[PDB]
């Protein structure tokens, strides 16, 4: 009795996504191939930024990810910054920059 995720070859849960879609008041019916497609996109999107966060964390001689690394990873990518446009991250800080005219 294999699960649907193993059949598709993913790591996110197909069945829970299907249930969430069904009991969410989106439409009268839900297709058979919709949860698989939706899960395969969420998995890629979350795996995209974890790698950047780990890269940002390795440069501070750290081995754990705290919100600052997530903020640094998100705000340093042009395509990723548009997605999280009007979003604030708790305990994130800001990106270091100074106007050129203020320097001596």
């Amino acid at each position: 009795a294999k699960t649907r995720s193993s059949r598709a070859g993913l790591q996110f849960p197909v069945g829970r996504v299907h249930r969430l879609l069904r009991k969410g008041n989106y439409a009268e019916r839900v297709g058979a191939g919709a949860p698989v497609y939706l899960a395969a996109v969420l998995e890629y999107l979350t795996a995209e930024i974890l790698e950047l966060a780990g890269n940002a964390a390795r440069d501070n001689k750290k081995t754990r990810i705290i919100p600052r690394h997530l903020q640094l990873a998100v705000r340093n990518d042009e395509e990723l910054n548009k997605l999280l446009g009007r979003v604030t991250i708790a305990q994130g800080g800001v990106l270091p920059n100074i106007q050129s005219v203020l320097l001596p």
Binding site: R68, T88, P96, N97, I98, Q99, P104
Partner: protein
């Protein structure tokens, strides 16, 4: 004695505060302000502990971004000192 020229200490403070991630306002006064503000919408409410923390965390990025825009407004007029005109112009253009 020793004395730094006007401008270097502020420049160092800019670098120091742009690297850390903490809360710049105190905690007791902010909570006492929130309670007084909310007391005129409904009497004797109660506040969950994390509600005030979320409010304070959300209310600081707003000020930081507004100051960031005010800096550009001030520089546009060949100045290095921010004035209330810049804040008013920034809020006018943003649509507030």
């Amino acid at each position: 004695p020793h004395r730094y020229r006007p401008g270097t200490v502020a420049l160092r403070e800019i670098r120091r505060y742009q690297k850390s991630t903490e809360l710049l306002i105190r905690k007791l006064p902010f909570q006492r302000l929130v309670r007084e503000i909310a007391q005129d919408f409904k009497t004797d409410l109660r506040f969950q502990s994390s509600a005030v923390m979320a409010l304070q965390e959300a209310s600081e990025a707003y000020l930081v971004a507004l100051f960031e825009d005010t800096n550009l407004c001030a520089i546009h007029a060949k100045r290095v000192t921010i004035m209330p005109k810049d804040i008013q112009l920034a809020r006018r253009i943003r649509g507030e």
